[PDB]
Amino acid sequence: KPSLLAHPGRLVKSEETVILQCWSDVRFEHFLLHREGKFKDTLHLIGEHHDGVSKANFSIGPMMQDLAGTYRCYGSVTLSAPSDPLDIVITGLYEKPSLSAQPGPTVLAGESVTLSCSSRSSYDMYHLSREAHECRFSAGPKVNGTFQADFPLHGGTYRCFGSFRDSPYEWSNSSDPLLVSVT
Amino acid sequence: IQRTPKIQVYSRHPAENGKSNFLNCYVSGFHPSDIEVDLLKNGERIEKVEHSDLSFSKDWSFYLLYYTEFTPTEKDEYACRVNHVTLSQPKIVKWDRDM
């Protein structure tokens, strides 16, 4: 199966562009990029050949909500197996949440650190990136009117995003970058 | 929600046989917005007919004005044929020069 990679990453800010790179070891003379989601599509590209690597660079234009979803790429010699799914999200559609750390952003190695993403906006879900693969559903409203989730977590800069269950690929503006220093 | 259109056939100015005028069909109060409106001269579709851009009232129901240039005579009859999902058959309203 071919490989599908987002450059610089699968988190695309609204009105910005991302490139999906489809590349294989097999010599395919054409490449297919198919999105499944709110609005589906199939994109056709000729296919560059260099050192036994067959490659195409699909450019995903000014990011809009209809371009977000799960992309797969295929190669043909005139269809190959699907490339594993690549979820491409849009971000920046909603107000940004606050990211905190208990006990504190700077800890010593071995201390458990937890991150709290919170907002007055009723996000159903919250996403933890650093690259993202952590989703924790929200809890709230809190007496404050806050909707919050906790990500039990060496070191890095963390962001967190809110989203709603109906549109899993549409996230809030990024939270301010929180740097976890594990000394 | 489905609303049957109200149909009014009329002229832009008081009909005067032999004088240029415009024949209007005002359809309003209807929902959904898909509507077929023809203007008929002695039963025959007039081919060059224009209409206003889709708008709607406060109750969310739509209205459209179809119109065509025409010279009323005593010998010619005019009508408006409206077709809409709420209609069993197309509805024809004849032009009364005093309505």
């Binding site: 609005f39 209809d66 | 832009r12 209007n24 929902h31 959904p32 917005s33 206003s52 969310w60």
Partner: protein, 272 residues
């Protein structure tokens, strides 16, 4: 005076992308249109034909983007109601600003309907929404996270008012000048003992009119046939009001015409 915009987006499942139609009015005078089915913002009144080509490019751009947002909105709306793919659905939005005698803001408004039914409206404070149902609560929640209420309050209180006052200056000879109606009464026999009296109001702008039949000076609110005010096509409006009277009692009936473009009401009487 007021400025209102009317959006109509209609899904064409399997017949292409949703059709988006928009119209802008200043009082009862349309001035702009847009149809996604080369989509261009287009003037419909001569006093906006005097904005420059950068006004109109900006306008077109927003239009085509509203058509792309509506296309996603209708795709969400169907999801909220668990509606199928095959069915056509309608999304309407009306918004704009009224002005008071001071030429400044009286009220702003922004209301939406889905398949003809109320859906979400901006509250008068221009800070909150009312959600018609549980589907519209998801939209409210997203618009609140979007911080939309402010975008709209900056529109309705600022640019909506500034451009209405500029439109009204640019069309002062048409928009700030009421045209009073031209009235006459017609007469038709009805069966053997009755007769129709029809009171006509033509060539009037704006469209707000009151026609009333009086018998000896008594209001005949019942037994009066009142037709919907209708566009004439030349920018003016038409309305008639009929009453069925006994043959030979026609002289007791007076028609009364009230329109803001009149320094005295019009009283009419069919005489034989």
């Amino acid at each position: 005076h007021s400025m209102r915009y009317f959006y109509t987006a209609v899904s064409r499942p399997g017949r292409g992308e949703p059709r988006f139609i928009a119209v802008g009015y200043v009082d009862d005078t349309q001035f702009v249109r847009f149809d996604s089915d080369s989509p261009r913002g287009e003037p419909r009144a001569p006093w906006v034909e005097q904005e420059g080509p950068e006004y109109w490019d900006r306008e077109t751009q927003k239009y085509k983007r509203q058509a792309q947002a509506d296309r996603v909105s209708l795709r969400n709306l169907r999801g909220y109601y668990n509606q199928s793919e095959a069915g056509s659905h309608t999304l309407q939005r009306m918004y704009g600003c009224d002005l008071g005698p001071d030429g400044r803001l009286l009220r702003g408004y922004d209301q939406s309907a889905y398949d003809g039914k109320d859906y979400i409206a901006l509250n008068e404070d221009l800070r909150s929404w009312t959600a018609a149902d549980t589907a519209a609560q998801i939209t409210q929640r997203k618009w609140e996270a979007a911080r939309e209420a402010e975008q709209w309050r900056a529109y309705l209180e600022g640019t909506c008012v500034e451009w209405l006052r500029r439109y009204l200056e640019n069309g002062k000879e048409t928009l700030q000048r009421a045209e009073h109606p031209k009235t006459h009464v017609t007469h038709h026999p009805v069966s053997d003992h009755e007769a129709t009296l029809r009171c006509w109001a033509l060539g009037f702008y704006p469209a707000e009119i009151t026609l009333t039949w009086q018998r000896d000076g008594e209001d005949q609110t019942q037994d009066t046939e009142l037709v919907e005010t209708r566009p004439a096509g030349d920018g003016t409006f038409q309305k008639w009001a009929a009453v069925v009277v006994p043959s030979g009692e026609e002289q007791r009936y007076t028609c009364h015409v009230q329109h803001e473009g009149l320094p005295e009401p019009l009283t009419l009487r069919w005489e034989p």
